[PDB]
From a paper:
The M5 muscarinic acetylcholine receptor ([name]) belongs to the class A G protein-coupled receptor (GPCR) family. As one of five [name] subtypes (M1-M5), it responds to the endogenous neurotransmitter acetylcholine (ACh). Despite its low expression levels in the central nervous system (CNS), the M5 [name] plays crucial roles, primarily localizing to dopamine-containing neurons in the substantia pars nigra and ventral tegmental areas. The development of selective M5 [name] activators faces significant challenges, primarily due to the highly conserved orthosteric acetylcholine binding site shared across all five [name] subtypes.
Residue numbers in the entry:
A (entry chain N): 1 to 126
B (entry chain A): 11 to 59, 206 to 254, 265 to 394
C (entry chain B): 2 to 340
D (entry chain R): 26 to 233, 438 to 512
E (entry chain H): 1 to 121, 135 to 248
F (entry chain G): 6 to 62
Write the structure that this text describes.
């Protein structure tokens, strides 16, 4: 059973810091590129950041490029999103998303509406 | 050693072989294209000539462009149907800075897909007139959506289009570089992004598709002759 | 409020289902079959190379006579093949070239056809006109046709990319039953030998056992890590195997309601597009993305043999009803028949 | 003495074996791979057929001529072998020219030529290549002794009689090597210019040297193999014995080496041919 | 509806020429190999000629070899029998027969209504029917036996014997193809079994519409030969 | 609203998959072993038949 459990959200002041965690189980976590996807209220799912399988290749969307930090612990099978200096435009439900196939550089469908390898999401309100 | 009916079944199989060969010769005369892009990209207005199939002919060379609108947003399985197309027509709204990263992620997923690793992408950076009006207005900033644009400069060894403000030229070169860096990050040159800037009234896109597919088949020939 | 407590209730139900499966997991299938003899090196050779498709083959479905087979390739053609003589029996031009599935009716009178047109096209083979005519177009799916299987001449169960499966009445053209519950694109379909049930593998890393008549999902089978592209019943109807993008094949009992055995190897990285059992079910053959087909000992999870004859991605397998041969279709526009 | 004969025979056996297995593997790679069953590989099949005729008949009979110091098969056998050797060598060069034109058309006109790269037109050009070779060499070699009424070739020797006559030597050597190598050099220079042009056009479009090596190799192999014989025949057509007989034999044999390297220069440049060659070498 | 209409028959002087045209409608004519089968008024069915689908292979009977030319025009959906040097033995009813050939196909399934041609005045498989007239009644089981000089069982497993029913005043129709398979439109009461040389047509629960002359035809090897014909008569 | 409805359908499906009868994995493995060794003689891919009975030769 592939399940992604997001934690570490909640209310925060503007300019504050908030760390997100993704409890991952049901798959070999080190074999997958992992994503963070957020959904603002009234807006669609947008990709935030991704991290490669070894943690080497890391990219962010431009609104969070100098502010967010995505990290993974392949031993603990968990994915992190260290969000610092949170603007009010980052008020969104943040979803831990796994790229659908292992050992792949492409990452299709993680911002789709009914994508399966994406958690229930944690609510971040700024 | 065959019977009379077994021999005539072989003759029917040979006629079916001949008809399949004729259909294959007819099908190889046209170049199959996959039209891709978001709902704001303006896919249907690119060429002025559930699956929306567009047939157009440039210089007596037939093009079959396929637009897939009959599926839902999960595309990782039906995009494997188009491994053998000549090119993927990727249309991007250049003015929509908010969905520009979404278009870059879509292009990166197309570019690094295993069954799309060999397909060159004809990238149409559509609505460059709206991009020009958004740049000249100064209200919507690319630096809010792309912080590396603030330290981006237009290259000195570059040829802007005439009658273009260098702010619009810097925006155009930056968006094109954002797609081209994804294209040149991987693939080892076996497939090539061909970027073009496109208005809603532009009538040169069929010629652009022709020239890029000309370069694609040229690259296939050059790889066949060990000329890269 | 209500959604959070419903999610907590779903979590508790999944937890007690997992505890029931753990309580029923007294000993694994590998421990039970540890004392039986291995099958040795299963070495199948290409007997027939079926040439004539000119684009990539997605699907092939054997006839129940174990001689005829339809194959679906995206050149817009369904070729029926007299596999004994490599004779093309029919060439069926398709209105949509983007075919992704083909079925062969057990009576032999019909073939099916579907793909990106979101339509399962039923083709009559026994027309008095002597050509192959479109008997019926089934146009209710809002996603691509990925698999279809006839139960008889009048009913066909079709899986689709709109996360649903549908049981059709071919004479009326309507969906008798819609099978909903998958959250990803349903990629594969396997009918039970008595056709009372069918399993469906989808892009949600889950296989669902459906009841054809009463229309519900009886059991949901998790354990794969990625999209299940491939599904095939064990010949007794009590188990089934799946093939997925996580480079593993997994065997699930219906009655034990869990995974029995994982078929994977360390150097296997690529996903599985097609699975099929042998006639006894001892050999699980699986078609892979690294252009080969690996024969698995279905009881011991041992790589029995490699069917390496394809120059592109193997997209479909089929084992004959009498078990005499395996036909592998691939993206190199060829069908190779192995035994 | 015996050292020389054994070294030359072993070198000839090695080169003829490489030529035979190379062109035979080109034909078998065509036969067993459907991906290699393309229209432009028909020309490579015709080139391999000419080069297989060269590697079987032309290399070993000319080495036998060299090592025995004489022609022991007779005047008719001499004339028939010279006709076969020159028709097959000219068919090799005409296949090189048709290959260079086919590559030129595929590179300068990538899309329009796909409708013209048909099996019928390929068969027409292959038949035209072999027919032009047969017309240029076969009746002249076998009928010069009847046109001039006498055979000036000695019984122990085996060479064309009209090689003494300067005008037909110039005409046949120009239509055999110099015009084909000039047109091949022009087409491959234009192909190199097209590669540089598409690289520059892509660099302009995106807002940003193996081609030179491969084209230089496939041109210089033909030039190095066929240039010394075609120089020395025009030296010999005016100055009867200016060319040493060892140098003459070396230049005449050097042309055969082009048939050895033509699978490397044209088939093995394709990656699919390389994969099929590696598959066939392990059986 | 599948229809074959024959035309061009008439009273021809001996040694003359006459053209037979078979108009095809209601089916894919170019996918069917076509046959001419003639029937003399004092004889049974006799195969004349065969043009394949696509006109690749053409076979003739040795009686009409050289004299007769069979041809087709696939865009016009027509079958032609150019007959030259007609003799008195050619006085027959010429039937236009369609026949498609694949695995599990039903050759000789539809026959034309026929045109009447009137002329004034070894290695072939001999197909023998032991009886020519069997007195029958409705509701009684009748077996129509046929024999072959050569074993019609082939190495592929198929036994190429074909059963036909020609009702009086009506064109022949195919009942059984390849010795066991029921043709389309034929009821389940018609059954055929054989051992490669001896053959039978088991007919159970006879009705009044089942009467007519029953022909067994081999399709093992050209020339195709028919039986003498077994006629069923009521009471 | 739609999330509540699909969660209600999900917990209804989990309730329907909860009250099913389950056998042991040892019994499942024994039944699959019995089917494999009860049909191994008539499995042509498992035991390769001679070429006389093989129609693919
Ligand atoms: C039986 C005739 C065979 N041949 C053709 O069929 C041509 C027709 C015109 N086409 S073309 O592509 O339209 C075109 C036309 C003008 C051009 N200028 N520069 C490039 C360019 C291209 C090219 C093919 C040519 C003859 C010589 C030759 C060869 F030695 C090898 C292969 C092919 C052939
Ligand atoms: C045609 C022609 O000039 O051939 C030259 C090569 N040679 C001398 C080895 C036969």
């Amino acid at each position: 059973q592939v399940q992604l459990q997001e934690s570490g959200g909640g209310l925060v002041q503007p300019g504050g810091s908030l760390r997100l965690s993704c409890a991952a189980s049901g798959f070999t976590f080190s074999n997958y590129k992992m994503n963070w996807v957020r959904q603002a209220p009234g807006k669609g799912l947008e990709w935030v950041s991704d991290i490669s399988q070894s943690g080497a290749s890391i990219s962010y969307t431009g609104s969070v490029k100098g502010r967010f930090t995505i990290s993974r612990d392949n031993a603990k099978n968990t994915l992190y999103l260290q969000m610092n200096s949170l603007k009010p435009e980052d008020t969104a439900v943040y979803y831990c998303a796994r790229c659908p196939a292992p050992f792949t550089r492409d990452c299709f469908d993680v911002t789709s509406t009914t994508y399966a390898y994406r958690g229930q999401g944690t609510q971040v309100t700024v | 050693t065959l019977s009379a009916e077994d021999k005539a079944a072989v003759e029917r199989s040979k006629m079916i072989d001949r008809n399949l060969r004729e259909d294959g010769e007819k099908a190889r005369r046209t170049l199959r294209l996959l039209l891709l892009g978001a709902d704001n990209s303006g896919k249907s207005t690119i060429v002025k000539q559930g699956i929306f199939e567009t047939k157009f002919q440039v210089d007596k060379v037939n093009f079959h462009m396929f637009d897939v609108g009959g599926q839902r947003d999960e595309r990782r399985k039906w995009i494997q149907c188009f491994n053998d197309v000549t090119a993927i027509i990727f249309v991007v709204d250049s003015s929509d800075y908010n969905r520009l990263q979404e278009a870059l992620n879509d292009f990166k997923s197309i570019w690094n897909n295993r069954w799309l690793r060999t397909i060159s992408v004809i990238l149409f950076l559509n609505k460059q007139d709206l991009l020009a009006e958004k740049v000249l207005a100064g209200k919507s900033k690319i630096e809010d959506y792309f912080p590396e644009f603030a330290r981006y400069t237009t290259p000195e060894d570059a040829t802007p289009e005439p009658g273009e403000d260098p702010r619009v030229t810097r925006a155009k070169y930056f968006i094109r570089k954002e797609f081209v860096d994804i294209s040149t990050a991987s693939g080892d040159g076996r497939h090539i992004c061909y970027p073009h800037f496109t208005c809603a009234v532009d009538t040169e896109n069929a010629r652009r598709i022709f020239n890029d597919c000309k370069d694609i088949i040229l690259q296939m020939n050059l790889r066949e002759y060990n000329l890269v | 409020s209500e959604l959070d407590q419903l999610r907590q209730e779903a979590e508790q139900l999944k937890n007690q289902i997992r505890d029931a499966r753990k309580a029923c997991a007294d000993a694994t299938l590998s421990q039970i079959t540890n004392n039986i003899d291995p099958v040795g090196r299963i070495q199948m050779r290409t007997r027939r190379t079926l040439r004539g498709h000119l684009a990539k083959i997605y699907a092939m479905h054997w006839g129940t006579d174990s001689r005829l087979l339809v194959s679906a390739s995206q050149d817009g053609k369904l070729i029926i093949w007299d596999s004994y003589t490599t004779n093309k029996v029919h060439a069926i031009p398709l209105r949509s070239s983007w075919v992704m599935t083909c079925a062969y009716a057990p009576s032999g009178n019909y073939v099916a056809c579907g793909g990106l047109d979101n339509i399962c096209s039923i083709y009559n083979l026994k027309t008095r006109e002597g050509n192959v005519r479109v008997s019926r177009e089934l146009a209710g799916h809002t996603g691509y046709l990925s698999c279809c299987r006839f139960l008889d001449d009048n009913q066909i169960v079709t899986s689709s990319g709109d996360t649903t499966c549908a049981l059709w009445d071919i004479e009326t053209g309507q969906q008798t039953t819609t099978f909903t519950g998958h959250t990803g694109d349903v990629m594969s379909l396997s009918l039970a030998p008595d056709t009372r049930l069918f399993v469906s593998g989808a892009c949600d890393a889950s296989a669902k056992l459906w009841d054809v008549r009463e229309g519900m999902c009886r059991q949901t089978f998790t354990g794969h890590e990625s999209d299940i592209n491939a599904i095939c019943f064990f010949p007794n109807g009590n188990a089934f195997a799946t093939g997925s993008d996580d480079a593993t094949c997994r065997l699930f009992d219906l009655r034990a309601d869990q995974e029995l055995m994982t078929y994977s190897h360390d150097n296997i990285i690529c996903g599985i597009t097609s699975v099929s059992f042998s006639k006894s079910g001892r050999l699980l053959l699986a078609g892979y993305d690294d252009f080969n087909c690996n024969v698995w000992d279905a009881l011991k999870a041992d790589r029995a043999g490699v069917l390496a004859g394809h120059d592109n991605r193997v997209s479909c397998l089929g084992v004959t009803d009498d078990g005499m041969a395996v036909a592998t279709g691939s993206w190199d526009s060829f069908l190779k028949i192995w035994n | 003495r015996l050292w020389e004969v054994i070294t030359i025979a072993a070198v000839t056996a090695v080169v003829s074996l490489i030529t035979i297995v190379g062109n035979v593997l080109v034909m078998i790679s065509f036969k067993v791979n459907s991906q290699l069953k393309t229209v432009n590989n028909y020309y490579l099949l015709s080139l391999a057929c000419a080069d297989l005729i060269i590697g079987i008949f032309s290399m070993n009979l000319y080495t036998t001529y060299i090592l025995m110091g004489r022609w022991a098969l007779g005047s008719l056998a001499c004339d028939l072998w010279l006709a076969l050797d020159y028709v097959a060598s000219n068919a090799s060069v005409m296949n090189l020219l048709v290959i260079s034109f086919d590559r030129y058309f595929s590179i300068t006109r990538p899309l329009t030529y796909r409708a013209k790269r048909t099996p019928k037109r390929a068969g027409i050009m292959i038949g035209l290549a072999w027919l032009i070779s047969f017309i240029l060499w076969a009746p002249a070699i076998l009928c010069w002794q009847y046109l001039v009424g006498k055979r000036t070739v000695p019984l122990d020797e085996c060479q064309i009689q009209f090689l003494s006559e300067p005008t037909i030597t110039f005409g046949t050597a120009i239509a055999a090597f110099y015009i084909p190598v000039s047109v091949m050099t022009i087409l491959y220079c234009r192909i190199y210019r097209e590669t540089e042009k598409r690289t520059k056009d892509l660099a302009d479009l995106q807002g940003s040297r193996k081609a030179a090596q491969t084209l230089s190799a496939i041109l210089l192999a033909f030039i190095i193999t066929w240039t010394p014989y075609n120089i020395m025949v025009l030296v010999s057509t005016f100055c009867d014995k200016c060319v040493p007989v060892t140098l003459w034999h070396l230049g005449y044999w050097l042309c055969y080496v082009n048939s050895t390297v033509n699978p490397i220069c044209y088939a093995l440049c394709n990656r699919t041919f390389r994969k099929t060659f590696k598959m066939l070498l392990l059986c | 509806d599948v229809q074959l209409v024959e035309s061009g028959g008439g009273l021809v002087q001996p040694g003359g020429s006459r053209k037979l045209s078979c108009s095809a409608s209601g089916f894919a004519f170019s996918s069917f190999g076509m046959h001419w089968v003639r029937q003399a008024p004092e004889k049974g069915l006799e195969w004349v000629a065969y043009i394949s689908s696509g006109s690749g292979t053409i076979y003739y009977a040795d009686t009409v070899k050289g004299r007769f030319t069979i041809s087709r025009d696939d865009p016009k959906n027509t079958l032609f029998l150019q007959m030259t040097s007609l003799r008195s033995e050619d006085t027959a009813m010429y039937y236009c027969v369609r026949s498609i050939y694949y695995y599990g196909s039903s050759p000789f399934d539809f026959w034309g209504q026929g045109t009447t041609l009137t002329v004034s005045s070894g290695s072939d498989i001999v197909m023998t029917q032991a009886t020519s007239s069997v007195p029958v009644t409705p509701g009684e089981s009748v077996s129509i036996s046929c024999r072959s000089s050569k074993s019609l069982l082939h190495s592929n497993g198929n036994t190429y014997l074909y059963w036909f029913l020609q009702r009086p005043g009506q064109s022949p129709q195919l009942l059984i193809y390849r010795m066991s398979n029921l043709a389309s439109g034929v009821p389940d009461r018609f059954s055929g079994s054989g051992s490669g040389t001896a053959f039978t047509l088991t007919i159970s629960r006879l009705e009044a519409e089942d009467v007519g002359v029953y022909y067994c035809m081999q399709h093992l090897e050209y020339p195709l030969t028919f039986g003498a014909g077994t006629k069923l008569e009521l009471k | 609203t739609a999330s509540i409805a699909q969660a209600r359908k999900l917990v209804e499906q989990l309730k329907m998959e909860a009250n099913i009868d389950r056998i042991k994995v040892s019994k499942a493995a024994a039944d699959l072993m019995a089917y494999c060794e009860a049909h191994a003689k008539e499995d042509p891919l498992l035991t390769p038949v001679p070429a006389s009975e093989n129609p693919f030769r």
